[PDB]
Amino acid sequence: FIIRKLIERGIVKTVKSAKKIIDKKEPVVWDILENVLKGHPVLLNRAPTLHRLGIQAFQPKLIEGKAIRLHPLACTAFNADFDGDQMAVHLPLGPEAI
């Protein structure tokens, strides 16, 4: 999606240049990603998935650090505490999936 926006903006014309720009971590990448995130939820999952509430869609926002920020009220659904638990993020692609 960032590559699509980079090509559309005229910054680059090929996929490889867009990938290089993304890997360089430029401010344009974050400017694109802020709008790319909107309306594109991610499925968060904690294993074991005992019931269907173990997979839940959340609208993501960019945050600092390397840890996923999870709403406390969802913890009971995930059986998730914050003593070292880990979560997986899956990105739906098609409009019907979103």
Partner 1 sequence: ARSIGPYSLITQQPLGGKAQFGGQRFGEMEVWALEAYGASATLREILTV
Partner 2 sequence: MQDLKNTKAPVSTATLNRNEFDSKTGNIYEAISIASKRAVQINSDIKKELLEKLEEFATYSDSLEEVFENKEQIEVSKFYEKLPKPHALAVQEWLEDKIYYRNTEKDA
Partner DNA sequence: CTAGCGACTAATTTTTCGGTTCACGGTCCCACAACTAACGAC
Partner DNA sequence: GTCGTTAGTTGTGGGACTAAAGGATATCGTGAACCGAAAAATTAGTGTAACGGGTATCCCACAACGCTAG
Distance CA 13, CA 3 (A): 10
Taking CB under 8 A as the criterion, which residues in 22-81 touch partner 2?
A: 32, 35-36, 38-41, 59
From 44-52, 64-72, 73-81, 89-97, give the range in contact with partner 2 by CB under 8 A.
Answer: 89-97
Type and span of the H or E element at 28: helix 27-37
Residue 10 DSSP code: T
Q: Does 84 bind DNA (CB under 7 A)?
A: no
Beta bridge partners of 44: 56, 89
Strand partners, 25: none
Complex with partner 2: residue 39 or 48, whichever CB lies closer: 39
Binding site residues, Mg ion, CB under 5 A: 81, 83, 85
Cβ closest to partner 1, residue 14 vs residue 49: 49
Whether 85 has a binding-site annotation, put simply, is: yes
- Joined together, the tokens standing for residue 48 give 């074991």
Contact with DNA (CB under 7 A) among 53, 88, 93, 97: 88
Phi, psi at residue 77, to the nearest 5°? Answer: -70, -35
